[PDB]
Symmetry: D2
Subunit: 254 residues, 4 copies
């Protein structure tokens, strides 16, 4: 069921399948508030910024195609990726997030993302959590620390951290049901066929192993990024957790 480059009759060499995928992930998330007017400039036409709430995350993801549920056995690097993002709370009519800036370390997740309107670049991303068998720290508990960082082209993009203060629950995260995407494929020559459309993307959502705590975030700057759009912020809360979901193709809105 491979649907992209490299196209061959077998489909073995395609980056992404036309198939349902499943994800499990561990996440470090920091909620922020920026000037809503600055964030609106980053939103595609038809989405309205909320009160400036933003989420920064660094996560470690494990995805599986329903078309090849055992692919991890022979191709482990095709089954895991890391990702960092700065996402903006917004509305279409319906509450959601628009993930304006996303960096991932596997291009199959980049392209799958782009096809469903997720703006992604390639970066280097690390999520560090205390391993539960680590005898010096144990795992997640009060006093545990979690860290994340992402970088691209030699530039630090942002750093995130959490000092865990207590076990948490769904109250400690700002869930908004929709994820809005901008499926965009521009023309570099006037004869090329462009695509530009708003889409909405997840079923079977489970969230758990939630810990809340004292967050920190430090934004970097790069000549080919626009990180300053998130610079003048209020840091609201931090949480770390695990989550699983299924996604298909994102549905065209307009």
């Amino acid at each position: 069921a491979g649907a992209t480059h490299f196209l061959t009759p077998t489909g073995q060499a395609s980056l992404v399948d036309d198939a349902l995928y499943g994800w499990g992930a561990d996440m470090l998330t920091v909620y922020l508030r920026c000037d809503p007017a600055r964030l609106q400039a980053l939103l595609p036409a038809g989405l309205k910024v909320a009160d400036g709430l933003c989420m920064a995350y660094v996560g470690a993801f494990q995805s599986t195609s329903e078309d090849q549920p055992a692919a991890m056995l022979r191709n482990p690097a095709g089954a895991v990726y890391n990702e960092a993002a700065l996402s903006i709370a917004c509305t279409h009519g319906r509450q959601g997030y628009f993930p304006a800036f996303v960096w991932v370390d596997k291009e199959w997740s980049l392209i799958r993302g782009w096809l469903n309107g997720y703006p992604k670049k390639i970066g280097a991303i690390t999520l560090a959590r205390p391993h539960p068998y680590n005898p010096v720290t144990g795992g997640l508990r009060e006093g545990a620390v979690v860290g994340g960082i992402c970088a691209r082209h030699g530039f630090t993009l942002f750093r995130l951290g959490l000092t865990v203060t207590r076990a948490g629950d769904a109250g400690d995260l700002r869930s908004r049901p929709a994820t809005f995407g901008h499926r965009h494929w521009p023309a570099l020559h006037p004869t090329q066929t462009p695509v530009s459309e708003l889409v909405e993307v997840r079923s079977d959502l489970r969230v758990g192993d939630i810990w809340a705590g004292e967050p920190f975030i430090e934004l970097g700057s790069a000549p080919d990024e626009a990180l300053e759009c998130f610079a003048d912020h209020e840091v609201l809360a931090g949480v770390t957790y695990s989550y699983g979901f299924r996604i298909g193709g994102a549905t065209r809105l307009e």
Copy 2:
């Protein structure tokens, strides 16, 4: 004038003319034309099975930011390996670069936008540095090497033992580069794109050409189709430098 994500008033790619300079290691091969045809998009017809494998070190610059290299050096260089198929569109002769791996996603996306099928890999081109006092630079007896890998799998290895200075007779030049600009729908409501394009590069210059004894060794990966190039005859090897300018690829027809 960034034209892609991230769109802000941070784009990977500019709507602008780009220039490249590059050093290249190239091995020409012949495979079964019938196997290669299966890799060609509709409307391109395989030639006699001629294929080219290359590993190159590229330096690209946008005319919109000709000095970007000063502040963003990693945005100005990339490495790339490819397996390309000699083919025709009508009577016009070209190459279709069926499998390409590059190590910078701005080159991946620029490639995809102009119909180059690219993945991200790790690619190294090693050529003798002219100031190296043990070897000197390129000359008779010099060796050149290239390798590319993805997901931990070796994709292919290339090499050359230089035998003599060369000239354009040693490059199997075909004027067109044909692409498949492809953007599929993952939901039936999404708008797909599938169109054949032709890249014309202006200002092409080739030089510092050396010919020699080639070698190639194909790997295998569960998410690649390297076997399509496996049963081959190794024809020739060359290393050289080349520069050109490219704009967008012109649309030829829908698929």
Copy 3:
């Protein structure tokens, strides 16, 4: 304790502090020709019956001295590692000699070398099913686990497991000692070399969440490696598990 040496000590790759590790592991046990493996052992170690261990792991290390360093330096707190290790003995004492090891963080490379663990830098991935993944679930009967490592563009080896059952410490082949060859050669005759056999024992050890299954291994080859030393093997067993440990400096046994 190492470069870069400064008055603060903040730029040292490796320090004297005690560390703890947690890890998830994929391990395949093998049997090779004992005579071939003996050629890889430093003087004073005797091969066992040819038993070997291949592993791929995702590791997380923390200093007792800086237990919260992970908050500001996450990439300094995690690494992946792959190894081919040889079961052997020093006298009647049973251990492993980890002949070939590849890691993706040089602070782990250097700590290894200082204790006689031979390490190179490679690219290493361990993939296990995430428990929240709704397509697969986590570790269970029928789950698959994969690992791969590569260097210089060459696949070094691939490992995998199809889980068949829950497991126990019985499915691991414990030999307490890790023998090392602490080696620092002279590149000029006036330089001071080091060559000595050392022994590490874990001062804290935990294994759990053990799953056994059907293994596979596929060795590659590279011009600057000696993977063929492990090539003609019998595949014995496979296991995936979680692991925790504490290690200090390795005690010198004898000069070489």
Copy 4:
């Protein structure tokens, strides 16, 4: 030769053969407070007037007795490197001590350490205009050159040059010696440590294709680095050039 030690020796990271290098270099000269730089120097080296050099380079090395290794192992034949080095003296002998070095191939890290060059692994890019690029041309008046290095996600430093004129050896601040601290500490009191000052001299040296221009440097910061030691500087000059050299092992001068 080093790990991995095998009878063949095909798996050693480093051999004691003579090597030759060719390289393209971006260099910025600086002056810092000599008192801060002295704190980074090992005992027996005296800081000069505070002159430091920052460089980013693309290197290509070849073993004199494996001169064709690049054909089959290209990644073993090239590396990138960034450094901050301190002008100093040993007696009245003038040299550089390369206090902080980041390289992207561990065989270059280890060869460095053996010869007393303190090296870590980083990601390093040197970008120079390719002569065949029709938008820019190559090196000329008005050309721009850039270099950057990073580790653990932290930018370490950035360098750049806007070329103003062709240059010559007058534009280099050549000091014949490179002084090293060959250091191999003990992690257990029974282990044999090494700590000695060494001197490397080039037995073949070439510099050419020199261009001078307007430099820039921007130091970063990291929790596991000490880049602030170079922070309060005066930017003196910038140059890009090509370089070739042969080096063997560094000679031991004295213990530390």
